[PDB]
Amino acid sequence: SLLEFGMMILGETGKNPLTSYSFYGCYCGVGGKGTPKDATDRCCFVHDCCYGNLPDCSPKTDRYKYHRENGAIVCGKGTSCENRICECDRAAAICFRKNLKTYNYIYRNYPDILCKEESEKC
Amino acid sequence: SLLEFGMMILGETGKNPLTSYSFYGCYCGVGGKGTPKDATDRCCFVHDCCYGNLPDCSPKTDRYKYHRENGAIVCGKGTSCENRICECDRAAAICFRKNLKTYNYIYRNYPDILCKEESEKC
């Protein structure tokens, strides 16, 4: 669920997701459209796609367990939905971490009106 | 949404909600029933009630903003749903903080089969 996702982002990036990953670019936040602005933004696009591919599940609300093994996120053994939701979240948290090096504060609060390109298909 | 709720619990208690508040007692976790075991557990019962009183809203998934003023949680100015959802979450995070003094690890992983009393009404 989004509870686990927030904690995973914090744990993997060191950043509060509410201040770094909730109103960023065209995709990191509510209502994604247009072309992702950069690699971080593309992480959000891909995560949206990953959730959209699970119409048989409830990715935002289905709780799951995870832990770490040798510093890395390992999803718990849950239902098939929990497993797939957890892997979406894990991939995104890792993506954010790998792309910290090009994170740009200038894309915070980027207005959706300028996300004006034909929205990328998953 | 649950993303903000997790961050609020962490910020107010200092504890990871996934390890302290996700499988505790009869109510802190999935599927609440029976009598709350203690004050912390009752926080979870009350939060469940608070969400249940918002059938016109989507408390687990509707994102909202909050910040702090003089160290205390202040909900952002959002829709009426966002405002009410945020206040449910704020009350619960504060409740957990106020009741840290009686938190008991013995109630972690408490089995739902023993939450066997007629479930308390909101």
> What are the domain boundaries of chain B?
1-122
> Determined by which method?
X-ray
Chain A residues within 8 angstroms (CB to CB) of chain B: 1-7, 10, 16-18, 22, 29-30, 60-61, 63, 65
Determine whether the interchain pair B16/A7 forms a contact, defined as Cβ–Cβ distance below 8 Å. Answer: yes
Looking at the complex, report in whole angstroms how far the Cα of residue A3 sits from the nearest Cα belonging to chain B.
5
Nearest CB partner across the interface for B61, out of A22, A61, A65:
A61
What is the SS3 string spanning chain A? CHHHHHHHHHHHHCCCHHHHCCCECCCECCCCCCCCCCHHHHHHHHHHHHHHCCCCCCCCCCCCCEEEECCEEEECCCCHHHHHHHHHHHHHHHHHHHCHHHCCHHHECCCHHHCCCCCCCC
Per-residue DSSP letter, B25: T
Q: Any residues with CB less than 8 A from the CB of A71 and at least 6 apart, and which?
A: none
Write out the H or E segment, with its range, that includes residue B75.
strand B72-75
**What's the CATH superfamily of B1-122?**
Phospholipase A2 domain (1.20.90.10)
The answer to whether B27 and B68 have CB atoms below 8 angstroms apart is: no
Residues shown for chain B: 122
